[PDB]
Write a protein that binds this ligand. Structure first.
Ligand SMILES: NS(=O)(=O)c1cccc2c1c([N+](=O)[O-])cc1[nH]c(=O)c(=O)[nH]c12
Ligand SMILES: NS(=O)(=O)c1cccc2c1c([N+](=O)[O-])cc1[nH]c(=O)c(=O)[nH]c12
Ligand SMILES: NS(=O)(=O)c1cccc2c1c([N+](=O)[O-])cc1[nH]c(=O)c(=O)[nH]c12
Ligand SMILES: NS(=O)(=O)c1cccc2c1c([N+](=O)[O-])cc1[nH]c(=O)c(=O)[nH]c12
Lengths: 388, 379, 388, 379
């Protein structure tokens, strides 16, 4: 029975919910658990699923050169095949034989979802700072009274009506027919015109800039701006990609990361994911494309994928140099890719089994006006009854 | 000397402008030629560049079972190392040994860059969501009712004038009825400013959003016809597909007249443009990007790669250079050479017309025409 | 008498206006003609000004390696010193001895001056295409007449007044008091509101974009956009700077130039200068900083300098390897730079002798309204007299 | 081994973060160290890096006539090749032989990046040029006169209301007088829209223009005090200057109390910031750019280089490496190395408050206060 060496990394492999009830190769489920099954079916090789005792993908001990993880299991002749998300890299392929890629991974940017749906009820006041709304109400009462004094028709219940009507630019009523009174109206009209023009102009400024801001969609975008903090992992090739790169865009990124504080290199991948979710659109974690898609397709469904692939990588099946099954596996992997079976399994374990299946002004943006209108009309009805 | 073989498929291989003066391997320029140098320099091997005579990539002629094109040259000893954009397939792999993919491609969607959209009839409502417009009418009725109800203790005419920044017909004198007027005067002010301001962003900033944004979207929309190649790998990929998305595409294409399957690539690249964006092409992700960055630069790309393929260097069974070459490819990929070459060779207001606001002239004409009927009805 | 070899390139050297009347070293004038004089004064070496018979700065014959121009004169022992704008380059300094730079030149971008001062009289109509102004006048007459028909107070001389007043949003007059008539007013008011709001919104779009456009001020700016066509000269180091460069910004520029058509490499420097002047802000010639400043400081005074120096170069005095005057000249050049004499001469020949010594809305931008207002009031006066 | 000498003037030389672990030439990082490598590799020479003990650049002590600092080390055989930002001067050149300038610098102007400007009292007039505002008043008088003149065949009140998008007091019924009203109603409409639209661009787009834009400008303006160094080359450059621009600067500084000449560089870099932009520093064009790209990144640069200087590598008289080094410098300059190193080590809306519109509240308060007097005068 061929000994398989796979790694416990969702969704590729993950123990079943009620796994204690099961035994053997049936206790495990995951993308890899279907890939190995399908490959066996074609070739015809009994496969006993075994788990990497340690939990490392593979990296020769810097001190003793000893191979670790499943890469070590293969070379040391303890596992005849390796079905896992094992990247095709020199060091690895220098000791083992890799199958043609089954999933072209790459680098991708993770950010939080827009979630920009909190238009406060009183959002029609943002252009003009409340301190001016406190200075208008006073000025209005301050102006209305002066129009009464200098005119003693223009009583104290009609002056408030003229001043209020003049400010809203829909007022005719009765015009001041005294030179002294007309002075008050003229300055109030000039005061009215500036405020209305200022409010209209400033409001357009708020909307256009919010319409011009765009989310990051490329590597240049993430680097040209330093507002969002973009970090990777301390270990792994997620950062090495830049420690020996040559493209200007990448070179700049490395500089920012190695300088910005605190440590952008999160201790673990799980930390980076949480950081983005708990930063309100201020941290952009960098992780492999495959795992990036998985995270976005699970609850709380707040992360997202932007752009494409900065680099080009690929996974594959692994076998020791000189295995009796180097051609059969390679042909079977190609046969699955042509038949679309890899896309079927990818869809199943990423979307089908994903808990989450899939410019204009809204009423909320102007909710404050519609509320002070229903309440205002409600105040009137009371008055009409109280006077009655 | 090693007789390398490739194909004159731009931008992978092309003839240098001054091809007549140049001699030897220097006569040809492209991505493959640069890639060839990177490999040779690594393995220290003298290599001569040749071109396949029939220009075919490789397809076994079942009638004769003789491999044609580049794949044929390799299996019959007439070639050496095909450094060409040859896709990795099962049938090819049975006769030749490929290398680890230098670059990865996938079927894509090819459409013309979105040109200025035709202004819809009622395009003068965009600043405020159509929902709001309904609530504005509902609020107009609300206030108009209150005015009458309060007064009993011309209302519609007053409210209509106040909303549209016009003069006031009358002036309420009661406290009960002045509150109703003041609030509405304010409500409309915010609206008028909200419409005017938002309408400015719509004109200042342009977006020209593309209709098709992914694969699924394209399939559903029937207006935008999508055609592949009559003999390309794409057509086969769909025929043998069972993913509902691609399934529906087959059905559509099977009964899509006039025939959408362009004979060659040239035909498709032209047809797409001359169709004003009503036609879409499904080709590889490499030639698509090249065209988008090739004059007149009028086509675009939308949607993720439907299926994953891979271009690879091929070697005859048992070639002594199989491992040297493979390892050299991987070295370039980690060093960024495979990407430096690819990026280099591939990538390196308005006055408002009548159409934008036409809608209101239809309302006006209608209004000033319906008005007449009312007089006829009355008298 | 020390033989000097200078080049006829303004303003460094240029024959006097009435030069035929003069002879000897007094016939020539220019920046270099003062530099050589000042150096002599300090050292004390009789200098006979001689002109390079050919007219080439210096470049060994690709076929015969023979040195040409003043660089050839020095090596071949025909000139003891070379006072000229001779750049300090390897090839040259490998055969002759250069003095410490007297003028730090570099690369610079030449463009035409803004000259954006042509606001047509009728510029208040740009936001709304004339075709809509033709559709408003008709609609106005079309609406005014319908208000008359359905109401037969609202005659034919008062309906034109109400319709005109309603459109300008300053009208009260008399309100339609018939349900049939009120329908006409309501739609006209809705028609009025949209046009005014559309005009105000669209006008803001024109101004903000014209306020956001900015002239090129760096090398990235010129490359990121392909609207302006930037070219150099076919010969000279003005283009070589990029044929072997390594900076991304520069590498991109070379690509554009070698591809864009027609030939961006102007036959001569004079062609490039004329091209910019005769392209309406569409050609950006690239030339040395020193000559760039000179051109901008001469009639018709239309070119300009933007940005700084993409590279770093330097001129100097030249002498043959082993000249009896290598230290005296070098010390004298440094003595002039400290004393500010070089800046004095630079100012004199670039600015002092330069024929050219050195956001808001203007009345022109709204000139059409003020004209149709004076004429309109002039029409009224006629009517008032004709009726009288 | 060659004992190279330099100076710990950042960014030219600095200690690597992990200096304690590193040994030898690797302990120091900077521009000079990178430049040293480029030269050594070219000339194939083993070089050891040393630091000048007293940190001085070089100034002859007239009392003893002994050269100090880096220049002293060279002339006294205790050093070799000073690859340092040593400026080329006449006195230095008499004892040491420099190289062709690797990089060129010049005196500059150092100011704090322009922060949001305080809103002027009458900042509500910016959209329309102050000229227009005058002609608007002139046009108001023009029409008001015509109305009376025409009618004779309240005028000021009508015109004032019409201009400020308010209601109409009356309605002229004569053709003679209706023309006068219609044109003004139109004129104001264009103005109101022109003000509202232009005011939007002023808020949307921000410019934050810097007060000082060149040398001449700085000299004239007295508010923005400009100070140099108490012992730096700059101070000497001005003292011996006769260009009117710099002349005036000397006069100002000679009687500029409190003393503007900052003792060190650090003091100037701080003083400039803590002065909220009222103080300006005149330093070199190299340290200025470094600070602008150094945290907290709050300073800026304005104006062209007042005078031209040059940093150069120095050699003792008759050094056998004088020509090798010089030629190596020129090679780097043409190859772009001198610039690659320099660029790398150096460079690598809002809600309107009351202040913006305050002016109108002063007009209003004034108007509603002047109005009262008129009543007192009348009665
Ligand atoms: N899960 S992960 O967080 O994205 C992730 C992070 C870091 C390294 C990974 C890795 C994954 N992976 O995708 O499972 C596979 C993989 N394969 C290799 O061969 C290797 O060397 N490193 C990795
Ligand atoms: N250029 S194309 O129009 O998109 C295109 C269209 C159709 C078939 C192609 C093809 C390209 N290509 O891109 O390089 C390569 C390629 N290679 C093979 O081996 C093969 O069988 N068919 C093809
Ligand atoms: N005048 S120019 O049109 O700008 C100009 C154009 C082309 C080459 C120039 C050059 C100038 N120059 O500035 O006088 C000096 C100079 N010096 C050299 O040593 C050399 O090789 N080439 C040149
Ligand atoms: N860093 S600084 O604050 O602008 C500065 C201020 C003052 C003197 C400096 C100087 C620098 N510098 O820039 O490198 C170099 C330098 N070199 C000399 O030889 C000399 O005498 N004085 C100086």
């Amino acid at each position: 029975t061929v000994v398989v060496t796979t790694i416990m990394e969702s969704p590729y492999v993950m123990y079943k919910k009620n796994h204690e009830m099961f035994e053997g190769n049936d206790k495990y489920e995951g993308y890899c658990v279907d890939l190995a099954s399908e490959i066996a079916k074609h070739i015809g090789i009994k496969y006993k699923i075994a788990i990497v005792p340690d939990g490392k993908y593979g990296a020769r001990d810097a001190d003793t050169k000893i191979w670790n993880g499943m890469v070590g299991e293969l070379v040391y002749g303890k596992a005849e095949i390796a079905i896992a998300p094992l990247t095709i890299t020199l060091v690895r392929e220098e000791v083992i034989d890799f199958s043609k890629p089954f999933m072209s991974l790459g680098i991708s940017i993770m950010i939080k979802k827009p979630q920009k749906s909190k238009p406060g009820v009183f959002s029609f006041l943002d252009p003009l700072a409340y301190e001016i709304w406190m200075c208008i109400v006073f000025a209005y009462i301050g102006v209305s009274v002066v129009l009464f004094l200098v005119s003693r028709e223009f009583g104290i219940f009609n002056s408030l009506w003229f001043s209020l009507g003049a400010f809203m630019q829909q007022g005719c009523d009765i015009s001041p027919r005294s030179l002294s009174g007309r002075i008050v109206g003229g300055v109030w009209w000039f005061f009215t015109l500036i405020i209305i023009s200022s409010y209209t102009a400033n409001l357009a400024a708020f909307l256009t800039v919010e319409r011009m801001v765009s989310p990051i969609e490329s590597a240049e975008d993430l680097a040209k701006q330093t507002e969002i903090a973009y970090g990777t992992l301390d270990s792994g090739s997620t950062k090495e990609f830049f420690r020996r790169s040559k493209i200007a865009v990448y070179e700049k990124m490395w500089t920012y990361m190695r300088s910005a504080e605190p440590s952008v290199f999160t201790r673990t991948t799980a930390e980076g994911v949480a950081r983005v979710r708990k930063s309100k659109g201020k941290f952009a974690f960098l992780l492999e494309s495959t795992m990036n898609e998985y995270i976005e397709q699970r609850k709380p469904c707040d992360t997202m994928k932007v752009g494409g692939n900065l680099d080009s990588k690929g996974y594959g099946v692994a076998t020791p140099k000189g295995s009796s099954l180097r051609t059969p596996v390679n042909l079977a992997v190609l046969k699955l890719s042509e038949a679309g079976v890899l896309d079927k399994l990818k869809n199943k374990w990423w979307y089908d089994k994903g808990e989450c299946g899939p410019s204009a002004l809204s009423l909320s943006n102007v909710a404050g006006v519609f509320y002070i209108l229903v309440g205002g009309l409600g105040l009137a009805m009371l008055v009409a009854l109280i006077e009655f």
